[PDB]
Paper text:
ADAM (a disintegrin and metalloproteinase)-17 is a crucial enzyme that activates proteins involved in development, immune defense, and tissue repair. During biosynthesis, [name] is translated in the endoplasmic reticulum (ER) as a zymogen, with a prodomain tightly bound to its catalytic domain to maintain enzyme latency and prevent premature substrate processing. To this end, the discovery of the seven-transmembrane inactive rhomboid proteins (iRhom1 and [name]) as essential regulators of [name] revealed the identity of its crucial regulatory binding partners. The active site of [name] harbors a zinc ion coordinated by three histidine residues, along with a glutamic acid residue and a water molecule, which together facilitate the hydrolysis of a protein substrate between the S1 and S1′ recognition pockets.
In addition to our zymogen [name]–[name] structure, we determined the structure of the MEDI3611 Fab bound to the [name] Pro-M domains, which readily superimposes with the zymogen structure (RMSD = 1.31 Å). In our structures, the prodomain is observed bound to the [name] M domain and wedged between this domain and the [name] IHD. The [name] prodomain folds into two stacked β-sheets, forming a β-barrel motif (β1-3 and β5-10) that binds to the M domain opposite the active site cleft, burying a substantial contact interface of 5,380 Å2. The C-terminal end of the prodomain, referred to as the “cysteine-switch,” contains a single cysteine residue (C184) whose thiol side chain coordinates the active site zinc ion. Additionally, our structures elucidate the precise molecular mechanism of inhibition by the therapeutic antibody [name], demonstrating how its binding to the [name] M domain obstructs substrate access and prevents proteolytic activity. The complementarity-determining regions (CDRs) of the [name] Fab binds to a loop, distal from the active site, in the [name] M domain, specifically at amino acids Y369/Y370/S371, confirming the binding epitope previously identified by mutagenesis. Notably, the placement of the F54 side chain in the CDR2 of the [name] into the [name] hydrophobic S3 substrate-selective pocket sterically obstructs an incoming protein substrate, which is crucial for [name] activity. In our cryo-EM structures, the BS and preceding region leading to the inhibitory cysteine-switch are missing in the density map, presumably due to high flexibility imposed by the binding of the [name]. However, the US is positioned proximal to and is stabilized by the [name] HD. The stabilization of the US loop is underscored by its absence in the isolated cryo-EM structure of the [name] Fab-ProM domain.
Author numbering:
A (entry chain D): 1 to 223
B (entry chain A): 36 to 55, 64 to 174, 218 to 476
C (entry chain C): 1 to 214
């Protein structure tokens, strides 16, 4: 049961520093070389760093040559990746991969720490009504959801009706806004005959920041 | 310099009369409290037909003709149960005598008094230092002596360096061949030199580069020595080409390691998926775009600023080679794996280095012999050649 | 520096169809190329190493071949549990970099998307920002992008469409474009509309919702 737990990773301003660690367990750490691999949000995934089994030969990618530092305390059974002078482009999920002690591939990966960087404090999500109306709705095409905008960090779990339903509700990947803050609006379509009959109240919760947001909107057609 | 108890001084030219298959010897000297009448033999065939000694340089290489008339091996008169190794030259003398349990050793004085021009012997007893299929029973081991070892323990001369290296390796092989790894007839799976590489000068490197022979140290130039693990890793990286065709590749160096350690080699394992140990198992590394073979080793012959005696150097070498042969450091919890000082003293493979405390300090513990047997049983069928000599 | 390429970037196949993935390098990697599979939301898992060998743990349907420059990964049968993005990696040089990424999803029948747009709310009017989100639900395939600009407006970055991930059970796609508008353009933009373009649809249904006009 080879498990590679990772720690660290959070909202940090540009020019900061992080010391996220790989709590490698279940195998002989001292003999296996390791790699540090990143994954941009919604994009491809690229290798970042390599370290020799004893820490002798260490080299990085071309983009992190002078800003990163990888070290191993084999006594404490843990792999480190100290990065300084972080940049906005470094927003990525950082996986810790164990290089295959045979060949040159990798067998087992970590779970990744969502290292997000921005000069924006964790602000509580705000929800604006996607209210149905006589003039704004036509036919059976009905819309309803939580217009969550200007929230930071991610992730935020999409719980609807106290999280009763987890399938059939489309949770759009959160999309960055022009203000540099996350925003998502999960929407599921239901028949118009039950638009004003059954209550459709959506909920959102921010796990890392312990921010729970719920906005109540009366089912009215407005004008 | 004067740390051990018995360190009586001898003069080679005056006391060693050296009276006379192939060439016999009946040399004698009045060392310590014994007349020490010896009997020694040497021959051409004692050296391998592929025993090539290369003294490397910066892009240049040379071959040194080993004097097979020199390295002696025989017995003490009146003691047929004894075993004595020796190496007699005009000035170079490295003799080691085993009889009645007690061990008598000889070294030139120039290694200790910091004056290389002194000629004298250092006779002492190691007990008084203050502190089953044959034909696949030989691991061709490659000897590497970096620039520090050649400059400090070889007077700057290649001949002394290779003579000392061969004598120490013969000592280690004599230690190895005696032990029976299974408490049965399965004995004699020792080592043998295939090729000695003597690095006479430091290897110039580009700034920011690394080498196991450079004139600095990796972790910090403030210290005068490398980190043990980093040095071993770099040596394995650099010798990867020359370590492919040899069962082992051992590096001999001269620097004062931190916290009193002297050597550390990659631990062996009989498992196929494990790399590092007796067999040259393959392991690729994208850093150098080359295969890396983890059948390496390391032996420093300097602790606490003073050159250590040949007995402690031999002990450190066989400790590193036992680590290579699959053994592990003895567990201090059990007295059967490693007893206290009174009942024979610590065994080999102890976490700390013990030079000559007691008699079984040169003997492998069964608690560490089992692992060596496990590794050898699976690696002999793969990377063990013939003895090729006597 | 070794540059690595994958083709096709996104391909569709049935359950029984034979999917072949081509991964071409910018050099002649001797034999060190290996593939990975990552399902959305999980760490990548290695399938094939040395470009011709299968890992102990991956089903024997995955086969790899190709030496020198041309490298290929082939899966004989697309079992419904192997629908995830694949990255090919070279492990020859120090800056070992992975491929761009190929994605495989369920091939189904031709779909008929729907059209709907949501204007900014009344509370949005007093908020100071007008946000418009479109509604595209239960459509196939995702390879249909719409970039509709209103009355010569510089729409970039903000007009980032949000599309859900291809589930292996529901297998339905939902899309929602993001349109950002200022209060100043409310008077100048008297026309509000959205565009659709899909392989199923014969004509672009211009679902336009103006204030009081449809
Ligand atoms: Zn040791």
């Amino acid at each position: 049961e080879v498990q590679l737990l990772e720690s660290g990773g959070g909202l940090v301003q540009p020019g900061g520093s992080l010391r996220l660690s790989c709590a490698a367990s279940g195998f002989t750490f001292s003999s296996y070389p390791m790699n540090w691999v990143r994954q941009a949000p919604g994009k491809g995934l690229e290798w970042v760093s390599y370290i020799s089994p004893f820490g002798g030969m260490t080299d990085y990618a071309t983009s992190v040559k002078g800003r990163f530092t990888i070290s191993r305390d084999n006594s404490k059974n843990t792999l480190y990746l100290q990065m300084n002078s972080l940049r906005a482009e470094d927003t990525a999920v950082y996986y810790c991969a164990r290089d295959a002690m045979r060949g040159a591939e990798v067998d087992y990966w970590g779970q990744g720490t969502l290292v997000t960087v921005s000069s924006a404090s964790t602000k509580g999500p705000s929800v604006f009504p996607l209210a149905p109306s006589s003039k704004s709705t036509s036919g059976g095409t009905a819309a309803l959801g939580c217009l969550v905008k200007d929230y930071f960090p991610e992730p935020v779990t999409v719980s609807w009706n106290s999280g009763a339903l987890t399938s059939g509700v489309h949770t759009f990947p959160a999309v960055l806004q022009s203000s540099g803050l996350y925003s998502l609006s999960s929407v599921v379509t239901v028949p118009s005959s039950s638009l004003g009959t059954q209550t459709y109240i959506c909920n959102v919760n921010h796990k890392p920041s312990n921010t729970k947001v719920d906005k109540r909107v009366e089912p009215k057609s407005c004008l | 310099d004067s740390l051990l108890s018995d360190y009586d001084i001898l003069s080679l030219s005056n006391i060693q009369q050296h009276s006379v298959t192939h060439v016999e010897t009946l040399l004698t000297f009045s060392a310590l409290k014994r007349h020490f009448k010896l009997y020694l033999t040497s021959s051409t065939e004692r050296f391998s037909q592929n025993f090539k000694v290369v003294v490397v340089d910066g892009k240049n290489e040379s071959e040194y003709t080993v004097k097979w008339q020199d390295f002696f091996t025989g017995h003490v008169v009146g003691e047929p149960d004894s075993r004595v190794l020796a190496h007699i030259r005009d000035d170079d003398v490295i003799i080691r005598i085993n009889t009645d349990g007690a061990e008598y050793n000889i070294e030139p004085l120039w290694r200790f008094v910091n004056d290389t021009k002194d000629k004298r012997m250092l006779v002492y007893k190691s007990e008084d230092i203050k502190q089953p299929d044959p034909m696949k029973n030989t691991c061709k081991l490659l000897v590497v002596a970096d620039h520090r070892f050649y400059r400090y323990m070889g007077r700057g001369e290649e001949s002394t360096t290779t003579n000392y290296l061969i004598e120490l390796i013969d000592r280690v092989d004599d230690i190895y061949r005696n032990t029976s790894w299974d408490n049965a007839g399965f004995k004699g799976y020792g080592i043998q030199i295939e090729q000695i590489r003597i690095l006479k000068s430091p290897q110039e490197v580009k700034p920011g580069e690394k080498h196991y022979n450079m004139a600095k140290s990796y972790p910090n130039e403030e210290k005068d020595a490398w980190d043990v693990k980093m040095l071993l890793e770099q040596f394995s990286f650099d010798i990867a080409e020359e370590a492919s065709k040899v069962c082992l590749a051992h590096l001999f160096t001269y620097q004062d390691f931190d916290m009193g350690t002297l050597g550390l080699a990659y631990v062996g394992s009989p498992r196929a998926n494990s790399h590092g140990g007796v067999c040259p198992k393959a392991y690729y590394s994208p850093v150098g775009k080359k295969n890396i073979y983890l059948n390496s080793g390391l032996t420093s012959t300097k602790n606490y600023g003073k050159t250590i005696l040949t007995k402690e150097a031999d002990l450190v070498t066989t400790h590193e080679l036992g680590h290579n042969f699959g053994a592990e450091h003895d567990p201090d919890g059990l007295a059967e794996c490693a007893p206290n000082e009174d009942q024979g003293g610590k065994y080999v493979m102890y976490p700390i280095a013990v030079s000559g405390d007691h008699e079984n300090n040169k003997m492998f513990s069964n608690c560490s012999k089992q692992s060596i047997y496990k590794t050898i049983e699976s690696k002999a069928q793969e990377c063990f050649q013939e003895r090729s000599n006597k | 520096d070794i540059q690595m390429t994958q083709s096709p970037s996104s391909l569709s196949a049935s359950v029984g169809d034979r999917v072949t993935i081509t991964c071409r390098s910018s050099q002649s990697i001797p034999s060190y190329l290996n593939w990975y599979q990552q399902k959305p939301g999980k760490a990548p898992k290695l399938l094939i190493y040395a470009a011709s060998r299968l890992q102990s743990g991956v089903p024997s349907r995955f086969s790899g071949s190709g030496s020198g420059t041309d490298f290929t990964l082939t899966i004989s049968s697309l079992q419904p549990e192997d629908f995830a993005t694949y990255y090919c990696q070279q492990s020859y040089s120090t800056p070992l970099t992975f491929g761009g990424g190929t994605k495989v999803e369920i091939k189904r029948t031709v779909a008929a998307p729907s059209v709907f747009i949501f204007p900014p709310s009344d509370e949005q009017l007093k908020s100071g920002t007008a946000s418009v989100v479109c509604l595209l639900n239960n459509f196939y395939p995702r390879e249909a992008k719409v970039q509709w600009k209103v009355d010569n407006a510089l729409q970039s970055g903000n007009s980032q469409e949000s599309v859900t991930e291809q589930d292996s059970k529901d297998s339905t796609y939902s899309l929602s474009s993001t349109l950002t508008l200022s209060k100043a353009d409310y008077e100048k933009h008297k026309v509000y509309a959205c565009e659709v373009t899909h392989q199923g649809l014969s004509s672009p249904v211009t679902k336009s919702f103006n204030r009081g006009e449809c």
